[PDB]
Each structure stands twice: as structure tokens, then as C-alpha cells.
Amino acid sequence: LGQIYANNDKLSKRLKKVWKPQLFEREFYSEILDKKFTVTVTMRTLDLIDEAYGLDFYILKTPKEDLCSKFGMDLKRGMLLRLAR
């Protein structure tokens, strides 16, 4: 949620502007939980999962402030509880 100058010229009108992410519904498989989840994601999430070599690594490695998802934090607790027990 921000503002822009029309035609990227400061001396022009200042307009409200919202940039929204492109959302995709994809299915992921968790090895630790042995379950498939249909989750709405962004292309950034897919790249981050690729760099982590899987959903489980992504969920476990990513700190709370970067996941920015209550669902993601619940998956982390689920995975961690299975590993702890």
C-alpha cells in the first residue's frame, strides 16, 4: 500500500497504488507428515522451496518472520513434534 507519481514525474499528481502478488494454488507433499496439502503460494515461495530442496526443509529452515504464515508455523510445529517424539 503506497503512492506513486503519475508518469514517474514528481511534479505530477500523486496517486494511490496497490501492488498485489500473483497467487497460484499448488499441491505439496510433506515427507515428515506424509500428507499432501493444496496451498495458495507465490512464485517466490516455489523458488524458496527449490533452494531448500523440499517443503519440509523450507518449513523447518525458514524463521517465523520470513514465513509470514500461521499455517506455515503450524506445519513447523507438526513436523517438529514428530521429530521430537
Partner: protein, 202 residues
């Protein structure tokens, strides 16, 4: 992902303090939208054989759509992680523990596969006496089947062909994979003539 930057400079806040943001700092310019960036490939290690690449343990760079939507979900491929790279590398040592594996390029396999499912139409002229020999046969491979065939790795049905009939020319791709193609020898008709006679009319 949309990447933005502020039009207006934000004054330094210092150590251990939060920046003082005026409402002019809400004005942004679009630096770059990363969806329009050139796409990079995804490096995967294959587990099962696939038409595009059919070797278990081959490091393949695929389109992110293909790997994410097909190979990885279905188990055909795995991530090229350090650990997975080691696991498959150990296998390839065991594969070659007896001896080094002979090199057969992926292209060569494809030509072999194409040669398995094709038949050569060796149109020959009625007027002139002809004998189909390796050099002649290699040329026909280029024109009709599109294969650039080494003359030396050529076989034939024992005696080389000399009259119209049915035979087989066995080409060895890279010297390892031998494919025998069905050979149909017909009266020479230029591509122009056949397209007028039949492709145009029929």
C-alpha cells in the same frame, strides 16, 4: 515479486532507533517486477527414465514448470542437493567399478530411437545400372531419414543391394548401438514429381 524504492530520502535513524517515516516516504517507484525476468532452469537428478532424458543419475537442467509440475511430484526426479549428488555418485562408481562406462551421447540414443522406428525409401533410377554401397547409402540416410551417417559404421544385407527390392541397412550410432532399418528400394522419383503425382492429387 514487485520491487519498489522510495522517491524521498529517509533520514538516518542511527544505532538502535527506528526510522522517522513521513507520509512522503510512502511514494514509491517500481524498480523491477521479477516475474518478467528471464527464466532460469532447475537442476535435478533423474531417478526414473524419461523421454527427454532417460538416465538414472543424470544431472538435467529442465524448465521449472516441467520439473515442478511433472518430474518432482511423480518421483521421476529428485533435487540436486549435495546429499543426493553423493548418493547417485556412489552408485555410478559401483556401476563402473568393473570398468569405465562407454560413452554414448544422448543425441546418439535419440538417433537410435528414431532409426528403430523408420524405414528408408531408396529410390533408384531405372535407366542406369547402380549398386547401393556404404557411401551411397549414407547419402540416402541424410536426404530421407535426415541422419548424417558415418560411412565406415555401415552394414548391409550381406551382398550390397543392386536391384529394386526389400533389404536392410544397419547403422551403428557411435559404434555401440546397431539399428537395422527396413530398406524399401523403389524407382527413382524426384521429391517434386512424387508431390505432384500423389501428395498434390492424394
Amino acid at each position: 515479486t514487485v520491487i519498489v524504492e522510495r522517491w524521498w530520502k529517509v533520514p538516518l535513524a542511527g544505532e538502535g532507533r527506528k526510522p522517522r517515516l513521513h507520509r512522503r516516504h510512502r511514494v514509491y517507484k517500481l524498480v523491477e517486477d521479477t516475474k518478467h525476468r528471464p527464466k532460469e532452469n532447475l537442476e535435478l537428478i533423474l531417478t526414473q527414465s524419461v523421454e527427454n532424458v532417460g538416465v538414472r543419475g543424470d544431472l538435467v537442467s529442465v524448465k521449472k514448470s516441467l520439473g515442478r509440475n511433472r518430474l518432482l511430484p511423480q518421483g521421476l526426479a529428485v533435487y540436486a542437493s549435495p546429499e543426493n549428488k553423493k548418493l547417485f555418485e556412489e552408485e555410478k562408481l559401483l556401476r563402473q567399478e568393473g570398468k569405465l562406462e562407454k560413452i554414448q551421447t544422448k543425441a546418439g540414443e535419440a538417433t537410435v530411437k528414431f532409426l528403430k522406428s523408420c524405414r528408408l525409401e531408396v529410390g533408384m533410377k531405372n535407366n542406369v545400372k547402380w549398386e547401393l554401397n556404404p557411401e551411397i547409402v549414407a547419402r540416402h540416410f541424410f536426404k530421407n531419414l535426415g541422419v548424417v551417417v558415418a560411412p565406415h559404421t555401415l552394414k548391409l544385407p550381406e551382398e550390397p543391394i543392386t536391384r529394386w527390392g526389400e533389404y536392410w541397412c544397419e547403422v551403428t550410432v557411435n559404434g555401440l548401438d546397431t539399428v537395422r532399418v527396413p530398406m524399401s528400394v523403389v524407382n527413382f522419383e524426384k521429391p517434386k514429381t512424387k508431390r505432384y503425382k500423389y501428395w498434390l492429387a492424394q
